[PDB]
From a paper:
A Fanconi anemia (FA) protein, SLX4 (or BTBD12 or FANCP), is a molecular scaffold that interacts with structure-specific endonucleases XPF-ERCC1, MUS81-EME1, and SLX1. Shelterin consists of several proteins including duplex telomeric DNA-binding proteins TRF1 and TRF2 that anchor shelterin along the telomere repeats. Here, we report the crystal structure of the TRF2-binding motif of SLX4 (SLX4TBM) in complex with the TRFH domain of TRF2 (TRF2TRFH) and map the interactions of SLX4 with endonucleases SLX1, XPF, and MUS81.
A short fragment of SLX4 consisting of residues 1014–1028 (SLX41014–1028) was sufficient for binding with TRF2TRFH with a KD of 750 nM, whereas binding enthalpy between SLX41014–1028 and TRF1TRFH was not measurable by ITC, indicating that SLX41014–1028 binding is specific for TRF2. SLX4TBM contains a modified sequence HxLxP that highly resembles the TRF2TRFH binding motif of Apollo (ApolloTBM), suggesting that SLX4TBM might bind to TRF2TRFH in the same fashion as ApolloTBM. We solved the crystal structure of the TRF2TRFH-SLX4TBM complex at 2.05 Å resolution. The structure exhibits a 2:2 stoichiometry between TRF2TRFH and SLX4TBM. Each SLX4TBM peptide adopts an extended conformation with a short one-turn helix at the N terminus and fits into the narrow groove formed by TRF2TRFH. Except for the very N terminus, SLX4TBM and ApolloTBM are identical in overall conformation. Two key hydrophobic residues in SLX4TBM, L1022, and P1024 bind to TRF2TRFH in the same fashion as do their counterparts in ApolloTBM. The imidazole ring of SLX4 H1020 occupies the same position as the side chain of Apollo Y504 in the ApolloTBM-TRF2TRFH complex. ITC data showed that alanine substitutions of these residues either completely abolished (SLX4 L1022A and TRF2 F120A) or substantially impaired (SLX4 H1020A and P1024A) the SLX4-TRF2 interaction.
Author numbering:
A (entry chain B): 45 to 183, 186 to 244
B (entry chain A): 46 to 123, 125 to 182, 186 to 244
C (entry chain D), D (entry chain C): 497 to 509
Amino acid sequence: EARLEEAVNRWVLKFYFHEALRAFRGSRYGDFRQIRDIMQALLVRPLGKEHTVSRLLRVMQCLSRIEEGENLDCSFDMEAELTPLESAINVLEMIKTEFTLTEAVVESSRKLVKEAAVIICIKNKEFEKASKILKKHMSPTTQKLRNDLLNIIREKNLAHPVIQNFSYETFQQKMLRFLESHLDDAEPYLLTMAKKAL
Amino acid sequence: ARLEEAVNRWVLKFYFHEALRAFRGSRYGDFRQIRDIMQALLVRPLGKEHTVSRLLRVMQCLSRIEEGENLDCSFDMEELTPLESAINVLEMIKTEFTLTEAVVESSRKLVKEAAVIICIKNKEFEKASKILKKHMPTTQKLRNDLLNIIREKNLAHPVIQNFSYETFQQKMLRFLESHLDDAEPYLLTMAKKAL
Amino acid sequence: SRGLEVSHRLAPW
Amino acid sequence: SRGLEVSHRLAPW
């Protein structure tokens, strides 16, 4: 019941979380992935996990899924039948719960992820997947888009403005801004100590 | 050391310390987990020099020893059993810690003996033979006992029966730790302060 | 039950 | 050339 290794592990987790966000923000996704992998390895160790660690990890989960979102070959679900962005949708719901966010606050960002999930499948000519995603998650306000995407899928029209104008870079950076807006902007202890040490 | 490097170094050394501590208490499960964290760290800037290299050689040796009973796993690009890889790492430890042949010979002997015996216990007689040939005027009685054990497929021999992998791996740890500074890592010092 | 490395899994399987 | 994660590889391949 003791914080000793847990205390250091928390410091380490929060340090790499900070560095992962920093990397993602500078569009250094290679660095992000490397840091992600360190954090994955830490998860087996005692962290004294509570709601704040849980919150950090959900955000990290969502970003990791978004960073792999263009890679349809990979999966985060044991039911390895979900595209990365579909898993991202799932994590966003957990983020809504653990950050206690209103529907109004999350709706806009959920729409982006859903839009991206469908478009990425379309760009990869995975029309049946896009169709399933569109059905499952977009089945009132974004009617024009849902209908555009439905026609794009039916007609296999990758040439469409909706598809051609889509920027995954713009999308993922928008998601980071959203996710970061619900986090504390505190400098991690290890970084503070390193600055002191030089 | 630059900013991220400074932290990565503290992190690496903290887990190194914890890994040694886990190994020392026969908590090999904890050791493997910490090993995996340190492996993940290796892709990050560490400002690697000779003392980081030293720490990692020791960690490399222990990791191969901890997996030593598992002949199914491999540490080299192609064919080597874990303990054969441990032998290789030991030569690098000798170089990077600048050790005498005298100081490392007895420990090299232990690893060599263990490498052959583990193969024999798994009835991997051809592997044992190759290792015995490759790596073994002092260990005359032993390598002749091992040569005869392999030739006769004699699992019942006292040399085989009395072998204790726990005893072996703990002797290897004591040897490796004896060339390390036993300083408390910064992050642990900081944690004790905080708590 | 499965621990944090599974329930809060960061990297793909 | 391959970096530290390869040359000082800790985990089995």
